[PDB]
Amino acid sequence: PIDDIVKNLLKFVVRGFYGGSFVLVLDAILFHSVLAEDDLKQLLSINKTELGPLIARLRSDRLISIHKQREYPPNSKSVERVYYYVKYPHAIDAIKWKVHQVVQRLKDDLDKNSEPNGYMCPICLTKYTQLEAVQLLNFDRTEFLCSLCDEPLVEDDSGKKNKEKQDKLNRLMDQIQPIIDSLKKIDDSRI
Amino acid sequence: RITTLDETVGVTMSHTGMSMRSDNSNFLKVMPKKEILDYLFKLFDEYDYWSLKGLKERTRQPEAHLKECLDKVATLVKKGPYAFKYT
Amino acid sequence: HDSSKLLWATEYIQKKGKPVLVNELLDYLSMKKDDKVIELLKKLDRIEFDPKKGTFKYLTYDVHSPSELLKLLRSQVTFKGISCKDLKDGWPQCDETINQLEEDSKILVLRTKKDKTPRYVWYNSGGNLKCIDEEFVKMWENVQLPQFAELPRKLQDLGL
Amino acid sequence: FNMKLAINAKTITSGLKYALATGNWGSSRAGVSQVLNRYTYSSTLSHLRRTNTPIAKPRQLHNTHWGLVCPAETPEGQACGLVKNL
Ligand SMILES: [Zn+2]
Secondary structure (H helix, E strand, O other): OHHHHHHHHHHHHHHHHOOHHHHHHHHHHHHOOOEOHHHHHHHHOOOHHHHHHHHHHHHHOOOEEEEEEOOOOOOOOOOOEEEEEEOHHHHHHHHHHHHHHHHHHHHHHHHHOOOOOOEEOOOOOOEEOHHHHHHOOOOOOOOOOOOOOOOOOEEOOOHHHHHHHHHHHHHHHHHHHHHHHHHHHHOOOOO | OOOOOOOOOHHHHHHHOOOOOOOOOOOOOOOOHHHHHHHHHHHHHHOOOEEHHHHHHHHOOOHHHHHHHHHHHOOEEOOOOOOOEEO | OOHHHHHHHHHHHHHHOOOOOHHHHHHHOOOOOOOHHHHHHHHOOOEEEEOOOOEEEEOOOOOOOHHHHHHHHHOOOOOOOOOOHHHHHHOOOOHHHHHHOOOOOOOOOOOOOOOOOOOOOOOOOOOOOOOOOHHHHHHHHOOOOOOOOHHHHHHHHHOO | OOHHHHOOOHHHHHHHHHHHHOOOOOOOOOOOOOOOOOOOHHHHHHHHOEEEOOOOOOOOOOHHHOOOOOOOOOOOOOOOOOEEEO
16 A cells, blocks of 8 residues: 555664664554554563653654643543654655755765865964955965965865765766655655 | 969979860761572562661671672662562 | 572572573582472563473563564654663664665664664664765755755745 | 751841942831941041931921030931931
């Protein structure tokens, strides 16, 4: 079905971009539609300060929504239980938008190392662009000086770093192809 | 009326702060494992429920060996009415 | 007391680790020549007693193979989970099999490499996914999601 | 127990020294302690006998001040009639 492909998508994303306890909680919610906080604590035998950041991380990524359910049973105690629930559409949207932001942020770094332009100053630790470089050129000197130091600059950026941004794009596409294929498979039915 | 102490001051002022004189008044001053196992089973014969600290106060011996002897033949209940007790 | 002889006899037969004859067990314990200890041993299901000759079997778990491990994992879905003690006592060095059981064939949580590592016994499907570069994970955590209804509007403008 | 750590003297010393040092008497009360005016002898005599009244009209001279408060010796300004002299 289409609902199971969303589960495999969440397994691939949570397993692929986070540690183990994250898919421990994730599968703990995939097994029980309403998972209480006391069940996850006694399940993984983790502390409260260890269950906190995990749920907060799974909520910051819009993967799961919480439901603080009331309780007034036996001892008339207002026992509140945070039941976790998987938010399928918001999680899928988070995965798609995060993939888009990764592709866009890894595409911008390739255009910078494609052609060196700016310079750098070791003495005052201040960066200078080509504009300020040609604006700090003198007639009695043969190199671009520095207003702070009135000393020559060193050419920043190089073509050697351009080979690193391409490998990140190729490896990122090879590691994102099954994820984006699952996204294109789920987005057919809009579920 | 109030009585004025007429002394040379240095004596009383010596009795004020540090005078190298303290106290002078009492106020607010306040093993073989098998034999230990057999003795523990005797204490169980007396009563099945006993706290580990009470057993350490009854057997009177090094406590490490007694803890090791309690972690083998007795189960430690942590909750309930017999909390922190071996049975 | 005879109960200390019973628990001492069970701890001794656990020190042996293999089925021996009942008379040989009474001879290894020297002064423990009581039959009530043997009867209380027959009443004990922790150390199974086979009526054929002298045989003493030890349960926590009979899991010593990766397949039996997978089955014991499948018997914990939508329930709870055991610990490390029972497996390491039933089979020596389970962490080696855990490291050999790649991709969610045997999971754990590495806490500290100095306290025998408090383990974990659950199962899923892949779980590995370590091919995801650390740079891609760092770029995944730096993304700040637009809260409330701003995210669906930002996704409907892109066409997703 | 120690008698040097139980009974402290800087509470009474700091309380009396601070209250008689500053104008406050602990803002409840202020302007109680003033520096002695040594401009002349009559300034010290008229200064020590000076009585103050914290803020019917209290500034006007009442008929009950006969022989008790000086009807002439009084400052001028904002504190007129609130300061009195014996
Ligand atoms: Zn410079």
